[PDB]
Ligand binder design. Structure first.
Ligand SMILES: Cc1cc2nc3c(=O)[nH]c(=O)nc-3n(C[C@H](O)[C@H](O)[C@H](O)COP(=O)(O)OP(=O)(O)OC[C@H]3O[C@@H](n4cnc5c(N)ncnc54)[C@H](O)[C@@H]3O)c2cc1C
Ligand SMILES: Nc1ncnc2c1ncn2[C@@H]1O[C@H](COP(=O)(O)O)[C@@H](O)[C@H]1O
Lengths: 251, 292
């Protein structure tokens, strides 16, 4: 049994606007790179499934050769191998088609996991596009997954609560965050050992892109000129705050 | 251009999609997913009994092809997102998701880099699938009703076993005029008690950052931000919240953001109107006392 998790390395997703700059409509190269946050939730879920089921866990990525060092974090968390297709497209159809080609080279795959959305493109498109190309059911915003007879019992986070679903057969699930899939922190020695675990590299395939043009990308300033209330004396500080809220007709 | 809205019967969400449709043409059609009267007056309306995209088979896509729809509008909701990607692929359509603005000349805007950046796009060749971010477009008033033609659903791949609403307390987050949000800085689930207290006193609601939700201190539906709820209260207390951009994305229209944070360098102070640099365990009890 084989679970695939789609993981994408991205520029540091905690850099504030104050410190954030673009080169050529993308993040300046100086920022620390890392697996995206929902991607790590998906890896964690995959490792939990591996632990419960005895499954193989294969991490598949489309991106830069030098992001292998970051993808190896997934190996240290418990994944068995990384498959990286080398390429630089942001286009969801190009990405998905290349992920599909990599997946088609892994024999039988029983389930595919992905993050709810990537930590740089903010879009939640690639997993659904890939599900379409694979002709498999897509389930967005899953937070838990259990193997059962015939398929998978899946809890999904909705806008008002949750849905309990049963998927028959294979599928593509995108994963949202809950306490139960906060990613584990691998030991220093596990990281070192993961340097030896398998990484397979594949060349990018020829495939079509979307007929959309990206006109511009900009970074809005974030500066409210906050009124800081002296708080050496907290009773005075809240007295001042309530007066100011009154004066400004907020409270 | 020939436009199809695909959504549940929910008037708030349908209304947002109608607003968007009006930028592109005068007479959208609608496919309703699931039950409920369809409000508004449309040229043609359809209904599918199932809300899960995986269960629709190819009838819907084949319809869209036959009828030569040029624009397909869905919401950025679990139901919209379950359908949008796969449907675009079946149409060979480009897709742009989480759309936050559309200019009069049809330049389409969306966020990048954790809502730090705004990207602008032009369609070169459609059909086009869009998913529209909730609470970014005004909801059109929907007047009258429209009967629906039943469409066939496909093989059942996913069964809906149970739908479970998050237990509700007090006024909804997205309706509240005062929101009190706790983050990682609160330190425990019990420590949220004083935030619940002050929220109750102000006829407000309690929110959370992803940090507090990941710790289990608040339920997932309390999360505010890019991938949670969007709120525009008069007053927003951000307590023990660093102010990551993805959090800030949920409060762009909050009128008065009040930061209470022990770290004077925290990013939240670049969004806040008022700020208290200090321990919330001192600030909030003091505020409660002053209010009493
Ligand atoms: C794709 C993606 C989507 C995301 N979407 C969201 C989203 O929708 N919503 C969201 O919230 N996050 C989101 N995040 C995460 C976001 O980037 C941050 O990780 C998160 O918001 C930080 O949570 P926090 O500020 O509560 O915790 P931290 O960043 O750890 O901040 C804790 C703060 O508490 C303060 N503090 C500690 N003790 C005290 C005390 N006694 N008194 C006062 N202050 C104290 C500290 O100074 C600190 O500033 C997303 C991330 C990604 C990658
Ligand atoms: N280049 C990629 N390599 C591997 N996985 C990806 C890639 N792009 C997107 N994904 C997966 O799809 C999810 C959603 O990405 P997106 O549609 O860009 O928001 C990510 O969290 C990953 O799990």
């Amino acid at each position: 049994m084989q679970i695939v998790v789609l993981a994408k390395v991205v520029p540091d997703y905690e850099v504030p606007s104050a410190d954030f700059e673009l080169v050529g409509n993308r993040a300046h190269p100086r920022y620390t790179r890392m697996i995206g946050l929902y991607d790590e939730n998906a890896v964690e879920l995959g490792v939990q499934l591996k632990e419960k089921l005895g499954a193989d866990l294969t991490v598949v990525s489309y991106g830069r050769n030098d992001d292998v060092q970051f993808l190896r974090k997934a190996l240290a968390m418990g994944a068995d191998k990384v498959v990286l297709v080398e390429g630089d497209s942001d286009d969801p159809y190009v990405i998905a088609a290349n992920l599909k080609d990599a997946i088609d080279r892994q024999g039988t795959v029983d389930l595919i996991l992905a993050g709810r959305q990537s930590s740089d493109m903010d879009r939640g498109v690639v997993p659904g596009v890939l599900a379409g190309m694979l002709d498999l059911p897509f389930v967005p915003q899953a937070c838990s997954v259990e193997s059962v007879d015939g398929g998978w019992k899946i809890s999904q986070i909705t806008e008002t609560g949750k849905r309990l679903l049963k998927l028959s057969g294979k599928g593509v699930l995108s994963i949202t965050s809950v306490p139960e899939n906060v990613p584990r922190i691998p030991a220093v020695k596990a990281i070192f050992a993961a340097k030896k675990k398998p990484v397979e590299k594949l060349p990018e395939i020829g495939t079509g892109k979307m007929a959309v043009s990206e006109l511009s990308v900009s970074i809005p300033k974030v500066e409210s000129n906050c009124e800081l209330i002296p708080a050496e004396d907290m009773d005075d500080a809240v007295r001042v705050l309530l007066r100011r809220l009154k004066e400004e007709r907020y409270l | 251009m020939k436009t199809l809205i695909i959504e549940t019967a929910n008037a708030k969400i349908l209304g947002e999609l109608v607003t968007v449709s009006r930028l592109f043409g005068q007479a959208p059609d609608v496919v309703v997913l699931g039950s409920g009267e369809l409000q508004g007056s449309y040229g043609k309306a359809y209904r599918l009994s199932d809300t899960l995209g995986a269960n629709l088979g190819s009838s819907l896509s084949d319809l869209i092809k036959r009828e030569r729809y040029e624009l397909i509008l869905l919401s950025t909701t679990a139901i919209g997102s379950g359908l949008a990607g796969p449907l675009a692929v079946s149409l060979g359509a480009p897709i742009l998701s989480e759309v936050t603005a559309i200019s009069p000349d049809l330049t389409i805007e969306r966020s990048l880099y954790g809502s730090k950046a705004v990207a602008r796009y032009k369609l070169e060749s459609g059909p086009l699938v869009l998913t529209i971010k909730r609470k970014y477009f005004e909801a059109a008033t929907l007047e009258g009703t429209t009967a629906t033609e039943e469409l066939p659903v496909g093989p059942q791949k996913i069964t809906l076993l149970e739908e479970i609403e998050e237990e509700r307390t007090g006024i909804p987050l997205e309706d509240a005029e005062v929101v009190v949000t706790g983050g990682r800085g609160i330190g425990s689930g019990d420590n949220f008690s004083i935030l619940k207290e002050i929220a109750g006193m102000l006829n407000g609601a309690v929110g959370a950052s992803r940090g507090a939700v990941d710790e289990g201190w608040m339920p997932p539906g309390a999360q505010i931000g890019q991938t949670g709820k969007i709120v525009a209260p008069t007053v927003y207390f951000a307590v023990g919240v660093s102010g990551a951009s993805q959090h800030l994305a949920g409060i762009s229209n909050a009128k008065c953001v009040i930061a209470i944070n022990k770290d004077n360098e925290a990013n939240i102070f670049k969004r806040a109107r008022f700020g208290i640099v200090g321990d919330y365990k001192k600030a909030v009890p003091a505020l409660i006392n002053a209010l009493k």
